[model samples]
Every structure is written in C-alpha cells, then in structure tokens.
Target: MLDAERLKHLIVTPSGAGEQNMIGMTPTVIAVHYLDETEQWEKFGLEKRQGALELIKKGYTQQLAFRQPSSAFAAFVKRAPSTWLTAYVVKVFSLAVNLIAIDSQVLCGAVKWLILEKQKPDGVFQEDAPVIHQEMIGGLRNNNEKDMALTAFVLISLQEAKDICEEQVNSLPGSITKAGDFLEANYMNLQRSYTVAIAGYALAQMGRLKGPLLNKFLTTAKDKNRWEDPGKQLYNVEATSYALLALLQLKDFDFVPPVVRWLNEQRYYGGGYGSTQATFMVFQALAQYQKDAP
Candidate 1:
C-alpha cells in the first residue's frame, strides 16, 4: 500500500490509460484548505516537498492561472465579475495564510501586482480583459476567467492581508459588509457556477453566515439531495472538500463521515492526490474536528 503521508511528488508517465497526470490541483487545494489548516502550518506536508510557502503563495497570485483556473492566469469566471469559482479558495487561503504564519507580504504582492501593475481592477488580477470560452480555438479563453474569479481571489487576499495588519486598529466591518452585500444581491441562488459549500466557505470566513435568506441557503446545503447533488454543477473536488470542512464546523458525524468516504473512494494507486486532496486534507480537518468536537 502507498503511504499518503509520505507522498510528495505526483508521478506521471507520458503514456497512461485515461487522461492521467501526476499532479491534480482540485484535490490538492481541497486537501490544503479544509484539512491542512487544522494544524500548525509547519507540520503540514504538501504533495511537493520543497516549496510549501511558494505553493501556498502561488495558490494565491496575480495574473497566474493555476493548474485549475483559466489560462490567462485570471482564475475566475466573467459573467458576474463579482463572484469567482475560487472565491472560497481565496477566502480560506487568506485566513489560513495568517494563522499558518505564511508571509503576508506575498499576498500583498499579489494585490499590488494585479491591482496596480496589471491594472486588473481592485478585485481582479487578469493581465487582459476577460475572454469568453467560445473566442478561443477550443471552448476556452486565454485559459482563465480574467474577471470574476480574479475579483474573488484579489478581494479575499486583500481582506486577509488587511485583517492581519489592521485588526487591532479597527473593524474591517466595511470590507466584510461590501463583500457580503455583493454576494447576497448578485449570488442569492448560488448561480454563476460556484458551489453551496464554496458559498458556505465565503460566508463562514466573512462571519456573516446568518440572517434569513442566507440561512435558508445554508440549510438547503446541509440537507437531503442538495447536499449530495447540489445540481451536479458543483461537481468539483475542491468544492467537495470545502463542503466537507464546512460541514465539520457544524459539528456532526453525519456530514464528516460521508465526505471522507467519498474522498476515500477517490483514492489513486500511486502517491499524491488528484482532483481532490480529500485524502491528505480530510485527515487534518477530521483531526481538528475530533480535537474540537464534542
């Protein structure tokens, strides 16, 4: 049996059955966000050994499309421009960067690079404007969203950066309020292609996971078919992983076990996680879940 703990590099062969590669981002991100955050940052192991900090920083960047996000390096969708497929990744990563003792300057640099240098907009980090998927030869843009996801990424990164520097001085109530209001108005139905768990991640991080309609959404997310299927539109490993971690916060055996079970079902024969980091991250989240849970 392969040891998940010992895994570092994702081994990929040029010739393989199915569309296979050694490293997959969604699983790794899921593993990192929901699970890795449970422990002190130093102890967490990445799929790669040498560059956890760089990995984490690259996980949040300027004009850099990750393995998962679009190609132009924007990493978000364009329709809403306010919401991103990775808004949760940014929100959680920002919080994790602080608690994990990651370099805040790196995050600041992402903001400065995108906002000032690229002229991508306060919330965006694209090198150029958004290009629809249809415009490209393939049904893809410059490979990234250029607009929506970048806003989500930059805003969350900025919020985390600001929180670290200025929480002692004042409440970022303004920033939180703006993000929350925008989400509530523009994204009430979980439309524009993000997930319920991702929505939960954003609201939970923002400390605004309450009120009437929001509560309804949360409830729907936790219960029945919505929890299982969620329109199948949110069929993502990272989002699945976020749903797992968020449900853990609610403190029940129900959500936690099923989430892990599904993750286990995703296991590969070789080392390193793909499509979901549920294997690595679920351990940390569950570890904390047990430590903190009653």
Candidate 2:
C-alpha cells in the first residue's frame, strides 16, 4: 500500500528535479542527465504544469523526453527555450522510455539523431555549448567541469535508452579508462568533492563492479570527512545521490537506511517527498533497492 501510494504520487505529479532550480529539476519533464534534479517531485503545483505544457506544445521538450508531458514528440520539435538543462532532461527521459519500450526501432532512430546533433563542422561536440550542458558537466571521458555533470548524465541516459551492439550513438568509447584517468589526476585525493563518486560510478558501469579499488572508495565514503559526515559541509544533491548509488553499486547497502531516513526528513507537510527530483530519485532508489534486499 505504501509503495502503491508512492507510485500513484509519482504518476500523477510532474517530476521534480535536483539541479540548480525548480524547473531545471524537472525529472519527469526532461531527459536524464549528469546533474541530479530531485525537486520535480513535490511542487508540481500549477505554474510548473502550465509552463511545461507550454514547452510541450511548442515542441522544444527535447531534453525532457515527453515523459510527463501530454505530447512527448511534439514537445521536442519547437518548444520554446527555458533553460538548457530542462530541454536535455526532457530528452533523457524520452530516451529512457523509448529505449526500454518494446519497440527498438524508435530508440535507434533517437540515438542516430543524437549523434547527428552532436556533430559540429569539425566533428567534435562543442564542449562548452549549452546544447547538452547538464549532461556534459562532469566525470565523463573528458572531465570538463563547465557542465561536466550534465555531460555525464547525457551518456548515462543514452545508455539507459539505446541498445548496445548496433547503435551509432554509443556510450563514450573507453569510458572506463577515461573516467578512471580523470579521477586519478583530478579527484582521487580530493575528499568529498564528488569526483570520486563520479569515477566510482563509471567504474561500476564499466564492469569493474567489485574490486579493491571500489572497496577503497566505499571506505572513503563512510569517512564523513569524505561525504555525509554530520559536521562536514556538502552541497549538490546530485553528488549526494551519486555517493549513495555508487556505494550501493559496490554492495554497500548500509547507506540505504540512512538515505531513506534522510529523505523522510525532507518531507513537506503534504505527505510526499522533498520539493525536488532528488527526493523522487532517493525515493525511487530506495524502492528499487528495497525490492532487492533479502
């Protein structure tokens, strides 16, 4: 009954995001990206819905993927611009939906289109462009922090949607090596900076799921000085979520209880989660892991 109620809430409301602001945090309305937007959960109140619908009708919900919008495909075409992050988010969600749906063709087409869009005259994606900034924000092959977090999200969303082997659009080649290299150079020694979590997640995806290195990071995570220490300072829900998720990937379920408890603390008077998609994701993550717990 509880899960059902959560599901119902998730279904009826527009997604809250975990990024810089409310609209940008729109998880249901945008494509999945490098940034974690947990705010789209609670405040689907009128203004957001109207604004999202306006974007949907205009056809620029490209980043959002039409997940929560009335017209998904229509939203991506000519939707008016809000922030670059929202658009990409719409795209990420759409890809996730299409890629996992029964029909593979649509997903493939979407991937191809993404590739075409990334092409510049020089054939290199403009690293600094707002086009996919949220996804290109961090912890990727290049580690460009400008919007590197957004950048990482783009690839992750793309991976969730498209099938592997045959797609022209693929996860960054040598993603593991690139991300690992970046961590070694920039973040390995930095405590609680989120770089370690980023690289650790990439490493898990690369099939280095269980190893001494992964274990080492997990140890670092509990240090509180590194992350989530009661007195330590940390910002960015995205990074927090990433830390929880990465540790889970390495088989550390200990953090699950705390993450859920922390989320419960974020609840508003409405009996739902926080005002962001980070709340939604934390809720989602708990649900997902709860189902798997023995």
What's the lDDT for all of these models? 0.39, 0.39
- Error of model 2, residue 3, in angstroms: 6.3
lDDT of 2 by residue, 203-247 (tens): 554455455656555666543423342321222343555665565
Global Cα lDDT for candidate 2: 0.39
Model 2 bad stretches (over 4 Å): 1-127, 131-148, 162-185, 189-192, 209-216, 219-236, 268-277
Residue-wise lDDT of candidate 1 within 1-294, one digit each (tens)?
124353344321222111121123323333344334343334444434335434444444322333222211222433322122223233344555532454544333333333334332132234243322221111112233323333333444445556554543233344445545554454455532234454455555565555664455446543321243433222333445455555555554554655555555555322332222334334434445545544
